[PDB]
């Protein structure tokens, strides 16, 4: 009887990020939500909590919990946070590759036409692992990391310039850790190069460097401060912004881990790069004219990913 | 911001509910946020996470942490979730939480006495009374969040059964916490149409309604049971923030909450969950429903519970 | 957009209401928009203006104009405002608008037969019937916008008197156009609480309620009188788009509108304004209220009006 | 009794733009609205229409109409669209200077602490006229034009690159007409220079020039097409976005007509420039490092304004 069905997003992993992405769907009435996890009780508790929030938000989406993959059938988007968060993130490889392969089998069987956003660390490597195991088209698989990294880069710059982060364009590309690459040269204030602001003394080169470093250390700082767990509010919104850009065919520039077949001279691997997300999934991969120095920094990020993928293959 | 400053909301208690209310402020660009807690470290971590979310939401509010009451100065609204959640029965938390609530009251009284205060700390109705007495704030500027959450549950369950958005289900719970809370079955409507008309047309049975009333009472406990640790926070955070927004934007929304009684329902000098209108004047109206003799009997049980807890509160 | 395409809404008629519904789609990023009109030039101008607004709203939907029905192919919803607004009594527009509505029906039947259709063209109830008969579309996929707007007025007036947000005022108008429209005084509630309780507590008098009922009936005419040219469009556009969104997002909202009757209220094979639930299945429920004998008498007057207009419609 | 009062915006001019800005306030629950105009009936009809929309939007703001300035007392923001729209916009000068001076007297008397956004043409000249007559601080007076011009510039670029306009930073500065200056060199896609996209052939220099020209002619095209009146949907949102940035102290980069005391070597005049709008009104005026060629184009815009102000003084 239903002619116009709601979009459906399956959260594979119902931890803090998963439950929070479910909350965002309720607040924005973005889609029905399935909180999936191989955990007893907890996912149902969060589904009841999120479901009950629809009343106060005056929205109507269905939030349910599941532990069997058949329940993710028909999902338009799948967001994966399942996997270990601690035992180096590189060290998570063996344990999470196994989990990601199980998720890939579930998606391949029940919702192979979905757009998939991986969050599981080590991210770039796990995205490749999911892509290989699931068999999905390269434009329908990506990883969330750089949107979150860029959010931090932007917030720090916005604080210094006293301008809303909406008007700060700052992008981080590459992989996780200290090799991530906050592109200082491409930071703009509504398209106006940051270098002009530095020249006017609105920000010093030293402050910029401090911000670049802070962007790299941001996730670890939150981990240290929380004492248990890791960030979830910004990560959840980062992933849902990518999901909405796909669902509503918005065509948003959102840096994320995408499959390369020549871009930046890279082949057969996923790495964080500026991309356009729309109803066709990853519709564009933007290849920046990196300077020689930037390429050298980027190569280190690339090498980190290549090394992990080498180890992944050895499994 | 020399002329127009942003509203400011201090979250006294930076646990799951506090951090999530901060998140809502970021998403809606509702107000600058202060995540306050006696515990140091964790609030600063959540403040960093919530502030970083402003970039993705394309909003601009400030989110900071604090462990000093001086930092809540200038707050337009204060939402208190501080307090023990278990004894080292919510009624038993009285001793421990009354002390914490009194410390919070001292902080608010001194640093932001003109704030609208929403208490969440259990045992709720008793703690609202405790805060009001210790803070000396105007009776219309102090209330407690509970019934909006209880009603959200009542509404969601009814919405699911009738296949209608909860926006269009008006269902209200009044009273205190526990099995004595009172889901008002007679006042449930579908866009103003009495639920009884739907039951008569077979869209729901009286048995199902009774089941829904009972599920409403047990809902919080079910989530506690299922999460395994802690309690609900997504709907509670949105319930409190919806009350805060109604005040900040002078919306004049009907939101049942723990309010000071000066004759309504024959009650005096106490707070209890009742339908109320929240606007820029704080609690602008306390709605007095024409309860049947049977509903009055059930309500009296909540009254008795609160009155007894308050007697102990005084005895401190 | 190879996998997930945006919803699409065709505005058949690009006058003030049509251009404004397009604006709402841009603001909410609800859907791509086609501003259709037999008149060329003006729709393209409004499409440029509405599309340029996407930049400032930071949204991304396509807004284009058209004068060929082929361009409405793929529409999920079609909202029709086309038709004369005055004879070169709305009842008298029948001849002229029936012809236009039939042409629109032919266009929809051929190019987007699976669309959910919201008719706005006067005389409304008769034109909905005309469209349904000419288009052959399923009865649950055709409706008319009028009562949501009439109810918005009823609610705003009540909200002003009680000093409560209209979000919390449930007030409904049913029936047809004109003085016969029926604002249901007995079913007005404040968050499900009967208005009678508020009147009894002195928050409003029966005289004021009667005044509000009359103002609700005269509201459209007052705006026509005051604007000097044309009629209301901001609230009408939002009323129609709210109905469209309920369908697109399968919200299941209670929105009174002109719906096909198959026994409800004892009516058959005709459309008339009634409380209904709009979801992804189109008109999912037609709510049958337990009207008193007096309300039935008033309602019968609307029924008689529609039945008489439909007799003439047939006689064409 | 009310401790937390709603913001209040007075629309001086209740034509299509005024009524539409009132609608936006209702939809966003941004502020109470006063639809002011020295017209009988019409403003009240629009106030009833906009007021009735609050019910469907489930919001609560008060929308009233007025014809006496005392009714704008206490306004936080004042948006002025009053004045003739036709008889060259330069030719409107004599008629609109008189109207703007009357509005300035009303604001100076009843809400001198308001943030004022002028829309009345010829814009840059009328903003100066209002500032001089009202006596308000230079940071509290500005004119809306460039946000609308930039919206067009951005939409056209977004269409060509298949990217949401959210991610297109394109700015127009200067005055109205063909002398407005769409800054082609500062157009970015999330901070990435447009020149890189042109190099990749995603857009040709010819298409860019066509877009620059189209941006200049956009308002006139709508006028031609509508047959009567001029654009109002994008203009209304442009002005309300500036008003909200002030009310919520957002610190948004919004190009608008602002007072210069040295910026770009300009003195004692208002002209469209990139600015940051926050709770302090115009908090920053961004001085771009314009190239010699850009300065030459800008000088023509400046000369147009200077000529009008010369004529304004001669009144």
């Amino acid at each position: 009887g239903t002619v116009s069905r709601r979009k459906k997003i399956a959260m594979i992993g119902s931890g803090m990020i998963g439950g929070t992405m479910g909350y965002l769907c309720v607040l924005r009435e973005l889609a029905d939500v399935v909180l999936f996890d191989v955990v007893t009780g907890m996912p149902e508790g969060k589904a009841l909590d999120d479901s009950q929030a629809t009343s106060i938000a005056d929205t109507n989406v269905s939030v349910t919990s599941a532990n069997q993959y058949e329940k993710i059938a028909g999902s338009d988007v799948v967001i994966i946070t399942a996997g270990l968060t601690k035992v180096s993130r590189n060290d998570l490889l063996p344990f999470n590759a196994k989990i990601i392969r199980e998720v890939a089998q579930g998606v391949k069987k029940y919702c192979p036409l979905a757009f998939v956003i991986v969050v599981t660390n080590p991210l770039d490597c796990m995205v490749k692992c999911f892509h290989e195991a699931s068999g999905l088209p390269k434009n329908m698989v990506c990883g969330m990391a750089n949107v979150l990294d860029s959010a931090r880069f932007r917030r720090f710059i916005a604080d210094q310039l006293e301008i809303s982060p909406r008007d700060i364009q700052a992008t981080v590309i590459g992989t996780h850790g200290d090799h991530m690459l906050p592109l200082a040269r491409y930071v703009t204030v509504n398209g106006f190069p940051l270098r002009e602001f530095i020249k006017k003394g609105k920000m010093t080169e030293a402050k910029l460097a401090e911000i670049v470093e802070r962007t790299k250390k941001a996730g670890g700082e939150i981990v240290r401060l929380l004492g248990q767990g890791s960030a979830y509010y910004a990560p959840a919104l980062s992933a849902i912004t990518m999901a909405q850009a796909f669902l509503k065919d918005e065509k948003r520039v959102l840096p994320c881990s995408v499959y390369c077949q020549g871009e930046y001279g890279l082949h057969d691997m996923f790495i964080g790069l500026p991309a356009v997300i729309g109803g066709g999934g990853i519709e564009q991969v933007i290849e920046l004219e990196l300077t020689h120095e930037e390429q050298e920094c980027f190569r280190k990020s690339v090498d980190d990913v290549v090394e992990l993928n080498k180890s992944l293959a050895a499994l």
Side-chain angles (χ1 to χ4, degrees), chain A:
Chain A
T2 303
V3 174
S4 193
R5 76 158 176 79
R6 302 177 189 152
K7 295 303 187 175
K8 180 181 173 180
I9 302 184
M11 310 305 173
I12 308 305
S14 293
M16 296 313 300
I17 300 180
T20 302
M21 294 188 289
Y23 191 50
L24 288 176
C25 289
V26 164
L27 298 171
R28 297 184 172 194
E29 200 182 70
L30 182 64
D32 286 331
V33 178
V34 173
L35 291 185
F36 178 104
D37 220 327
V38 293
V39 176
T40 63
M42 182 273 272
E44 177 63 5
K46 294 193 185 175
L48 287 166
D49 197 7
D50 274 333
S51 173
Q52 284 155 20
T54 60
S55 298
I56 308 136
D58 288 321
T59 57
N60 198 12
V61 293
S62 167
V63 186
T64 53
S65 62
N67 56 59
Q68 296 305 294
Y69 287 111
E70 17 278 82
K71 297 298 183 181
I72 74 172
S75 297
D76 298 295
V77 180
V78 170
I79 312 181
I80 307 165
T81 54
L84 298 191
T85 45
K86 292 178 59 188
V87 173
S88 166
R89 277 164 292 190
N90 294 337
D91 297 329
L92 296 170
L93 176 64
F95 317 89
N96 290 347
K98 174 175 187 177
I99 296 159
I100 288 291
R101 279 163 180 163
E102 276 181 46
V103 178
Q105 308 310 311
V107 170
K108 178 184 180 182
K109 182 169 187 179
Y110 297 105
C111 60
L113 299 179
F115 177 66
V116 182
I117 298 167
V118 177
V119 183
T120 311
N121 300 180
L123 196 269
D124 296 312
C125 179
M126 288 300 97
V127 181
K128 169 81 173 61
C129 175
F130 180 88
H131 178 244
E132 191 289 316
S134 72
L136 267 63
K138 72 169 181 180
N139 57 297
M140 300 297 281
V141 178
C142 67
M144 187 297 284
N146 292 160
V147 166
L148 171 67
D149 300 320
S150 304
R152 293 154 169 173
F153 194 20
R154 289 165 63 203
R155 186 63 270 178
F156 302 154
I157 294 167
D159 287 343
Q160 174 60 43
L161 300 179
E162 305 190 309
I163 289 181
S164 166
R166 158 64 180 78
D167 294 316
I168 298 308
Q169 289 75 49
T171 307
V172 175
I173 62 171
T175 195
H176 65 270
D178 301 325
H179 283 151
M180 74 171 65
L181 173 55
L183 298 162
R185 181 172 66 84
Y186 285 110
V187 171
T188 62
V189 173
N190 192 47
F192 312 143
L194 180 66
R195 80 192 177 230
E196 291 196 23
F197 286 73
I198 293 174
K199 257 195 177 177
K200 310 274 182 182
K202 291 285 194 174
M203 178 183 300
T204 63
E205 288 297 321
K207 174 57 60 180
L208 173 55
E210 171 199 304
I211 287 178
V212 165
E213 175 71 1
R214 191 167 175 211
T215 296
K216 296 178 176 164
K217 300 294 190 289
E221 265 302 272
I222 286 169
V223 163
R224 177 179 71 71
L225 293 166
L226 295 178
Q228 177 178 56
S230 62
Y232 42 99
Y233 291 120
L237 182 55
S238 291
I240 283 293
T241 294
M242 287 165 68
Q244 178 174 309
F246 166 74
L247 290 173
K248 303 194 71 173
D249 185 27
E250 303 181 330
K251 305 193 186 302
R252 286 291 298 279
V253 175
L254 296 167
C256 55
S257 190
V258 300
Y259 189 74
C260 300
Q261 273 190 82
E263 298 90 341
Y264 295 85
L266 304 181
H267 300 87
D268 193 32
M269 62 175 280
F270 282 76
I271 191 163
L273 296 172
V276 173
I277 301 186
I282 303 301
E283 302 185 350
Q284 301 181 47
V285 170
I286 297 168
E287 188 179 46
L288 301 174
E289 293 184 28
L290 298 187
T291 61
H292 288 315
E293 167 173 42
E294 281 158 4
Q295 292 175 44
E296 194 49 53
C297 293
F298 187 58
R299 285 179 180 179
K300 292 182 185 173
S301 237
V302 172
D303 197 65
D304 281 358
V305 181
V306 169
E307 284 302 338
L308 280 181
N309 290 343
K310 173 186 164 182
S311 300
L312 176 63
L315 296 184

